Amino acid sequence: NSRYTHFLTQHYDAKPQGRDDRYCESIMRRRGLTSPCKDINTFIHGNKRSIKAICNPHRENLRISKSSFQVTTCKLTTPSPQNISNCQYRATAGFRNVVVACENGLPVHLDQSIFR
């Protein structure tokens, strides 16, 4: 499903290096979440099977996972004058239960609000 694979593109990174500001700068860029800059974005780590397991037709049910996941949240921050155009991110990494919308047994959206 395209909603699900879009979810993976925006919110899944199996094995992250660093999980710091530098990590956020890199991954937001390569997942196409810059130009224009996305305001906040959280990545869930670990294996893909465990995320799918949190969850017809275009109806979505909101679910919080029963176990926690390693996550890294990238939040848009105050740009430096030397590259005001570029997207500057602050990373917040943690072990959190995640809230997703499930459609047909697959996660298709992440509730970004709880990581704000």
User: Which CATH number does the domain housing residue 105 bear?
Assistant: 3.10.130.10
45 is catalytic: no
Binding residues: 19-20, 74, 98
How far apart are alpha carbons 56 and 28 in whole angstroms?
31
| Contact in structure between 45 and 15 (CB atoms under 8 Å) | yes
**Both structure tokens of 115:** 């990581």
Question: Helix (H, G, I), strand (E, B), or coil: what is residue 90?
Answer: strand
109 is catalytic: yes
**Both structure tokens of 103:** 């459609």
The DSSP symbol for 84 reads T
The DSSP symbol for 12 reads B
The approach used to solve this structure was X-ray
Return the residue matching tokens 């996972």. Answer: 65
Residue 101's CB: how many other CB atoms inside 10 A? 18
Phi first, then psi: what are they for 50, rounded to 5°?
-70, -30
Number of domains comprising the chain? 1
Binding residues for tRNA: 19-20, 74, 98
Phi first, then psi: what are they for 54, rounded to 5°?
-65, -35
| Contact in structure between 48 and 114 (CB atoms under 8 Å) | no
Range of the domain at 115: 1-116
